[PDB]
Amino acid sequence: ASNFTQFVLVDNGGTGDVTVAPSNFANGVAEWISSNSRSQAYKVTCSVRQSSAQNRKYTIKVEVPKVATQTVGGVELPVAAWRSYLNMELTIPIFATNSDCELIVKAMQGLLKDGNPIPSAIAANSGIY
Amino acid sequence: ASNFTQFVLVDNGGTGDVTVAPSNFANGVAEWISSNSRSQAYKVTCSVRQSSAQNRKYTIKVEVPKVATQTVGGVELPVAAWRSYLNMELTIPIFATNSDCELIVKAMQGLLKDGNPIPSAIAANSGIY
Amino acid sequence: ASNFTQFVLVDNGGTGDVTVAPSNFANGVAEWISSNSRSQAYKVTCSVRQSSAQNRKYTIKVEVPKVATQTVGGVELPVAAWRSYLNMELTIPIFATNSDCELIVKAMQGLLKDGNPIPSAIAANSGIY
Amino acid sequence: ASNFTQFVLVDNGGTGDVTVAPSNFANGVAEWISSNSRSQAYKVTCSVRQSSAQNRKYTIKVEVPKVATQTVGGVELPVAAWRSYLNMELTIPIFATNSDCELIVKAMQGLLKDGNPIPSAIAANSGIY
Amino acid sequence: ASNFTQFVLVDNGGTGDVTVAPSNFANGVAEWISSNSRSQAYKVTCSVRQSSAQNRKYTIKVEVPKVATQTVGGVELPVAAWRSYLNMELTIPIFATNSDCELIVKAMQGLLKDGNPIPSAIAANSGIY
Amino acid sequence: ASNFTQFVLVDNGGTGDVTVAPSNFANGVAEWISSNSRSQAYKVTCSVRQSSAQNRKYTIKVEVPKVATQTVGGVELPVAAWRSYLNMELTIPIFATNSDCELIVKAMQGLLKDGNPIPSAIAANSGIY
RNA sequence: ACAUGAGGAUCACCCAUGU
RNA sequence: ACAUGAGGAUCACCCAUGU
RNA sequence: ACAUGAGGAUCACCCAUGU
RNA sequence: ACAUGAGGAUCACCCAUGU
């Protein structure tokens, strides 16, 4: 068994779907990268650690690129015009049973579901109002 | 119009669903809290700001409580035995059109969808393997 | 294949069996824990390192908790009254054939077979005499 | 009781089984060895002592010879190329009843049971994957 | 995908082919070995990492045993007289698309193709003349 | 004989094949480059040195360019946008027979055969997983 | 860093010693 | 190194303060 | 000079370490 | 205050370093 597998980061139906695959697991940091030029690839990293006697802390990171071609002196290169950086840290007391962890996961999924306040503000370059 | 409304943080079908409602919007930080004792409530905060000339930064936070009764000297109080803290920061260059922001949102939803590596490791008190 | 699968650590004859599942492979240390709060889980860890130019050393560690519910600060938390620690290191020469290895495995199995000296002494809180 | 008796270490289903028999008790340290020279013998030693005020600790040591291409009764050097060493340290808190100790013995038998990850890795000259 | 599977390393046209199979993944470093003792095994290991900000680097290592006059399962010393070591470091600029990478793989297959200078020199215990 | 001949480094099936021809043997380093300006050529170098009293070490180096036309100082020059570098060192004991060597060659060929793990990971800008 | 310890642990940590 | 910060990044880096 | 490094490179060059 | 950190929290606080 492994959970260090490729998965769909961006679901665009079934065509235009962004798939991120395992690339490296050095020093406890799992990394996934989408295919083609590393310069225009999506990247996900995830590590977990005992942050204190009572807590374990997950550090999850995602990079969404703005794909573009850079032309400098007639030599063009595939680059990312720019990138968005999602950095998230989740702390969980060592007392959490498996049911507690699941509730935590639902809370995370709910916060981001379509229609809810946060994903709507972001999807529209807005804030709360 | 407003997006500062109540929403379902934890969907448990249609009964056992955790709903978080607007509570305060002081100094640009939107807060939502579930009902009943504030001591055992769920909390979501979200603020957005121009972090640099090119970027706007969202700071989203969620608190999932472990509901318990504390008894001290015969006087019981509704408390949270402990809490999980989700802290996330999302940076977006000011060049992102609305389509870019949407792609960013899908990437966030995809990372957490059921079955994918990250929500599975968390839901099971595990790491990547 | 992939030998990183789950298994029953304590076989209580199909009912009350303690099964341990894969949970982390960060740093080359394969970990397996049981479904519990991490404060009350059985943990099994395994790592192999080429300890010398001509040896390989496996380091296997097992933790068996005595579960309990403790009232700290007036609140109840799932905890482990105590833990028993098994620590084994096995050093095998690089010259050992697959069958040479199969012999080490049978030797460890026989050593702990019910009814033999060592497991009898242990289960009876006794020494060998 | 009297548990310091002869036992089958490597069970080959009757034909070519390896029986190890009492050979030394200097210092309360029970030793068992097979019918061979000591350079080519299967050896097992076991002792218990109270490690700390809260723990008792069993120290079990097993030596297994590299058998493929072995010359019985011969002088094989370096010793290190022809022998595998197993070292087990079992720590049991003074509170552990006999029943607690029996469960621990099961946890050890389960870890080494045929078909489980750990024994299958050792036997195949592998690690966890 | 899932490319960490068993493959034929030395193709002898069916009879006496050498198949190498997954044996370790500690640290994201995939390892494959043949069915032998580790002193006489065929071994392959591979890892990728981002070497500099502009490059990614694959490190592939192969170990091949001296087979002429070999005693299977035997202890053959010095180790250095009985083993050949191959070390490959492939540096690929982050701009390289998948198609660029395919061409590179061809450049490697061509270099080692039968009848070409490099493989013919190695195989004849020679240099270039 | 003379193994210092030309060969097709990138076989694009008879049309668009990159052949590399012998170009220098100064300093015991056999060099081969493709027909191009030296700024845009594929280069292959090979040297063998008796690295130890009992070893011989082959050092093979391959360079695959990403060709481009760059406008420097208002003028157009044939250039290489970037280069991918392969670096391999093979160490063989002086005790290796011609057939022992032929085995190392087949092992390197199998390693890179289309469809096997390593060349699949590389061509897909991926890691082994 | 190794190495060995019927050295310790709250257990992927600490000790002491021979290199 | 710990910890926190609606501190910053080019994103497993960097900055400030309370152990 | 060797030696080893899932050390780096602009790649027949540089690094660090055990001799 | 900016910035970063698989730095910490009791979580819009606190810590370190590069402006």
Side-chain angles (χ1 to χ4, degrees), chain C residues 2-3 9 25 58 66 84-85 87-89 91 95 98 100 103 106 109 112 114 117 125-126 128-129, chain D residues 1 3-4 9 42 56 58 66-68 84-85 87 89 91 98 107 109 112 114 117 125-129:
Chain C
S2 172
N3 43 15
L9 182 65
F25 204 173
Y58 286 87
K66 178 52 173 175
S84 178
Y85 303 97
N87 268 271
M88 44 164 77
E89 310 191 313
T91 313
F95 310 102
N98 272 2
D100 281 329
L103 223 58
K106 286 161 172 296
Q109 294 178 325
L112 300 164
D114 263 343
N125 269 292
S126 161
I128 271 71
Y129 66 96
Chain D
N3 40 221
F4 193 14
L9 190 65
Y42 274 85
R56 268 209 311 138
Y58 288 85
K66 167 181 162 51
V67 178
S84 303
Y85 301 90
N87 192 291
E89 276 201 315
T91 300
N98 274 5
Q109 290 168 0
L112 297 168
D114 243 18
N125 265 306
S126 299
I128 304 293
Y129 59 88

Side-chain angles (χ1 to χ4, degrees), chain C residues 53-55 92-98 100-101, chain D residues 66 68-69 78 80-82 125, chain E residues 37-40 72-79:
Chain C
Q54 304 178 10
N55 287 118
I92 306 180
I94 56 163
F95 310 102
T97 270
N98 272 2
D100 281 329
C101 289
Chain D
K66 167 181 162 51
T69 81
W82 291 95
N125 265 306
Chain E
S37 62
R38 299 198 71 131
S39 67
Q40 295 184 324
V72 211
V75 174
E76 303 163 323
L77 285 327
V79 167

Side-chain angles (χ1 to χ4, degrees), chain F residues 9-77:
Chain F
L9 182 65
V10 185
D11 168 14
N12 275 325
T15 44
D17 287 12
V18 173
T19 102
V20 119
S23 50
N24 202 351
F25 204 173
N27 299 307
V29 180
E31 185 189 69
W32 283 261
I33 96 291
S34 60
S35 290
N36 283 94
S37 60
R38 213 104 173 145
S39 60
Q40 291 187 330
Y42 279 76
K43 178 154 151 203
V44 175
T45 63
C46 175
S47 72
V48 201
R49 148 197 60 163
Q50 182 102 5
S51 74
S52 135
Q54 304 178 10
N55 287 118
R56 282 174 61 250
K57 180 175 163 168
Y58 286 87
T59 304
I60 308 155
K61 216 255 240 298
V62 182
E63 286 178 18
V64 182
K66 178 52 173 175
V67 311
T69 302
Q70 163 163 91
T71 303
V72 178
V75 186
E76 281 180 19
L77 300 171

